[PDB]
Design a binder for this molecule. Structure first.
Ligand SMILES: [W+6]
Ligand SMILES: [W+6]
Ligand SMILES: [W+6]
Ligand SMILES: [W+6]
Ligand SMILES: [W+6]
Ligand SMILES: [W+6]
Ligand SMILES: [W+6]
Ligand SMILES: [W+6]
Ligand SMILES: [W+6]
Ligand SMILES: [W+6]
Ligand SMILES: [W+6]
Ligand SMILES: [W+6]
Ligand SMILES: [W+6]
Ligand SMILES: [W+6]
Ligand SMILES: [W+6]
Ligand SMILES: [W+6]
Ligand SMILES: [W+6]
Ligand SMILES: [Zn+2]
Ligand SMILES: [Zn+2]
Ligand SMILES: [Zn+2]
Ligand SMILES: [Zn+2]
Ligand SMILES: [Zn+2]
Lengths: 269, 269, 253, 263, 250
DNA sequence: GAGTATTGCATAAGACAACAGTGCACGAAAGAAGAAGACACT
DNA sequence: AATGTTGTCTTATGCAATACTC
DNA sequence: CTTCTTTC
DNA sequence: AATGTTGTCTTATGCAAT
DNA sequence: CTTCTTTC
DNA sequence: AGTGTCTT
């Protein structure tokens, strides 16, 4: 049956259940036949990726431009968020230039303070010599991303949800439909980012401004296990941050801290 | 604090968790406040009951065109599947014409038999008076689809993902990567259709041939309950088909048969 | 019924038994209608070539007939090659399944190594012989006459005198196969499709066992519905139907 | 839209509710327009409301219209529930002309349960008895001109006459309406008095006749915590329900928890 | 049920769908009844496009000409009689069918001198109706003639029908076609015409548009299991969309 | 009074999203409406 | 050089407190 | 006889 | 007029031999 | 001192 | 000297 099944899959590439039933082969073997085939293994998962987040506020920032035509003429919205505090700062601009990046960054620093590093995309206004000189002056490390995959920029584009879903609702509330009047744009914006920092975020236990100015940093965390490349669970780690998607775990022997998917962490003892 | 919370949401449109905590209101009330707001319409009521299925073999067919450049210059693949037996029939054509549709349906009839009804999407070939007058002589019911949002012919469009992949796997297996030579295209077709229809489809207990020529039609099914618009569970129904996604259920008092989502059916007693 | 049957024969030229059954007409009338018309398993297969000047440019027609179910499969070609035999055979196996053996003539297209290894990978026996023996090559020959007759008859019925353009050829062969396969032939009271597949509609489910309160597995049940969480199984004797957890059901034998 | 509405009434003499809706004019203005019209002050008014639905009890009579000569006999039939007027012209009041008129009224409004007529000669004949018996519609005679048996059609006749007269005076027909335009004129009057709103109601008469198509009803819990009657639910999907107010037909969506059966 | 259907067909020769609904009979019996009798592309909105055509029937002498107009969407029909072929007859018949059904938006006609005359030209413009003059129109003519033969031979009229008997049979025909069936359908032409309109206003909905956005401003007119018919409040355009693509407005 | 249906309420339990600068660009196919020359109108 | 995000949306259980039905 | 339009 | 669908895909659980 | 390649 | 539907 094993050779007959191999020949059958060679010619027809029959799935494993059919070969297992037809030739009376156990499922592990039939699956082994599909696995050993080069063309039929065209769907392995091989998925991973952590945003990542910072262990404390004013450490990791993310910034990107988004287009909200309601703010016309200055329809470009530069959005920035701290990964630890989840607090949002936004300004309006008419053109996406490095001047707008250093201006917006100047405002966000004027509100929340100076961050350790800002994580942007591969845009031309962020990769300009002038921007590198600006962050060279303010001492902020620069981290770009994949060319076209904003998944790593997730928790800033996630902000672009609120900033665009809150501006819609608040603008419709004051009776503005096609374009927000220029006299009330500042009020709209101020109330907008006012509602998203001093007040909780749905099921969030604290407010983003409280998580900003009064963050929770564990000195030494509780012990956890992590699932390592071979699929095994390894003791000897402690967790410092455990969020919804991902957790930050620290190795006990070195104090190195890494971010891993939640599914790959379980309590140690 | 019902009015205080309402005012807070009026101005800032604060979520229910925040208003419930801030104004000490129970959950149901705060949620009612968010619900009662028009510009915060959640909504999210989109009726999920959606069922494109038929009862018996040769009763309801699905037919659509798709592009696979491996068969060029005749790369146009016409696909027709029987919704009850899941038996696929595909024919290659250089250009999508009503004559090509009548040729395809002529072959699928020459293999499976004359169907009672065929459901397609409203294209140029199907909505022509010529194809209409062709189904006229053969007595086959014609059912078009929504202009653009083709999610109902899915069990044929999904068939393309079942089809074209089995093409590639058979093409790469024979050393043909870019375009399959004209001499072996038809053999590729026959080998694909024989691999799909004459063997189990993954977890399928019967083969499409065993499901077509030896189908299983229940004289009368076991009793079930269905969840009705008000959310209640109503007795007095019997289930005739219970698949992975959807179920066909029959009303005991009238013998009227309707299709409903699996999640909306449970055993009666 | 008389006019409906006449129209049916006009278009498809269906034999008299099929028209008699379909339109509920007695034998003498249906047969008289055929007279009044001017133009009127899986054990061993017989494959042969036949040329039809009416299917130009690709006028070669490959025919395969099952010796037990009398099915008919046809594919058009432009020239007889060793590849054409394996292509047509691939189509036939795709249609009606893999047979056990095929009988052909002493032609080079059937006896070449290119065809031999093809029949070897699929496990199909082959026995050649005299080109036209009565053991033999007689049945597939009758299939060729029937097929060519039906081709010229349906063609001249739709208004195609001698040459059918390249567009409607596959449609012609399609309708021909439909008539000669899904309808009764001559005086035979069953269709070749029914002779090949035995289309028995299953009135119930396959047999299963259910785990009873004492933990034992009890035979004598068949399952009719398997929904989320639970399964409906029917007792074959009393026809009582009960619902039980999926985990409490396993195949019987 | 004041001038457009004025022109509309000039030609068709449409009631105020219809002009108010068609040209988006407030009620007080439209009513002032109807007041300023001379033939809208004759008037007469046919609507003057039981609890039975359409096709329950009809009324049928004959009236004279010398302008419609030679076919000067107008057979009028109106519904006592939906208030729909159907009329055809004849040369003489016969027993077969009532079968023709009623046969016409069947093809447009369906078959009623009964038809109340007077003691006229053509209503108690043998031919009318055969036709009425073939169509299975009940019939009751009565006194010609009392206050209960013959109530609405008495006004319906003057409605029709003082409608065709006015629509004809607008085209230049004063002494006698020509024969080639008899059915055309009559048709214009019917389309003016059936498909359009007349008086002040919540639905147009043509809608009044064709809505046996509705809620359970339901009650909804209003902001003050009270339960308010007067709504019907038309759609109940996952999470929310659409309910319609019976007095206005306004439809709003509310949470499922806020709905319970009314009575 | 068998006797009720047989009597109904004996007198009116009613099609099988109507007898099946009226007497609660399955399709096979009613169809068998229609068989035993010897004398026996979809549209999107009513009152929008009509199709008028002339037809001749010498049995209706001296006014042998007829005139049939059909609402193509709601499967409606209306017929009148005329003596000669002129323009005032066309304007007369249209003026009647308007009162029968309601002011249509456009009416398709045939090639003819009566439809192009000056008076007929500006008559439709006076009522604000479009003229196009554009296969399946003549079905209503034979539709009318077969039913006329059915009821005429039902009451015993074989020869030429008197002038004082034509109208009653016309109304008997139009009633015998509008209220019963169209031969194969599931809903009477009246509900296809008169009762999508009686719905005052549906509930508000949003629809997901090509760009993925949700657009306010629509009301739903028909809500079935799979699909809903929704009407734009600003334009009255009606489209059919998947249930999953609709959510409540406010 | 005592058993019980039901209301109040709180999580939790699967999920659904849309965030990515704008999406409209082109093409075939089948069917319907607008435009230039010709020979009647007057 | 440099990784997918949470903010909500409905319904499904487990336990106090009215409002009922004997 | 062109474009113009609705779908795939 | 006319309804998001399944065949894989990985990693966790119940019946019988060294 | 204009015209391409990158990315958003 | 003005235009008008029909053919395509
Ligand atoms: W070629
Ligand atoms: W070639
Ligand atoms: W070729
Ligand atoms: W030759
Ligand atoms: W030759
Ligand atoms: W020859
Ligand atoms: W020859
Ligand atoms: W030759
Ligand atoms: W020759
Ligand atoms: W060729
Ligand atoms: W060639
Ligand atoms: W060629
Ligand atoms: W060739
Ligand atoms: W070729
Ligand atoms: W070639
Ligand atoms: W060719
Ligand atoms: W070719
Ligand atoms: Zn393989
Ligand atoms: Zn709000
Ligand atoms: Zn014949
Ligand atoms: Zn007036
Ligand atoms: Zn009949």
């Amino acid at each position: 049956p094993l050779r007959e099944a191999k020949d059958l899959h060679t010619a027809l590439h029959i799935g494993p259940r059919a070969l297992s039933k037809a030739s009376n082969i156990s499922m592990q073997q039939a699956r082994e036949v599909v696995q050993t085939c080069p063309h039929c293994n065209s769907a392995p998962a091989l998925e991973a990726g952590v945003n990542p987040r910072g262990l404390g506020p004013l450490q990791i920032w993310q910034t990107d431009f988004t287009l909200e035509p309601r703010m016309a003429p200055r329809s470009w919205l530069a959005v920035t968020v701290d990964t630890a505090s989840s607090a949002i700062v936004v300004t309006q601009h008419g053109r996406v230039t490095s001047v707008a990046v250093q201006h917006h960054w100047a405002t966000a620093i004027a509100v929340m303070g100076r961050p350790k590093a800002i994580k942007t995309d591969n845009g031309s206004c962020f990769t300009s010599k002038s921007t590198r000189e600006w962050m060279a002056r303010w001492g902020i490390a620069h981290t770009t991303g994949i060319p076209g995959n904003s998944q790593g920029q997730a928790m800033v584009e996630r902000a672009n949800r609120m900033m665009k879903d809150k501006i819609r609702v608040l603008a419709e509330g004051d009776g503005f439909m096609k374009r927000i009047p220029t006299s009330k744009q500042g009020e709209m914006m101020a109330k907008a980012m006012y509602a998203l920092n001093h007040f909780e975020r749905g099921e969030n236990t604290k407010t983003p401004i409280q998580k900003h100015w009064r963050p929770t940093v564990l000195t030494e965390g509780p012990p956890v296990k992590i699932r390592i490349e071979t699929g095994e669970w390894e003791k000897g780690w402690n967790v410092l941050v455990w969020g919804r998607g991902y957790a930050a775990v620290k190795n006990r022997d070195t104090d190195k801290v890494i971010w891993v998917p939640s599914r790959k962490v379980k309590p140690d003892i």
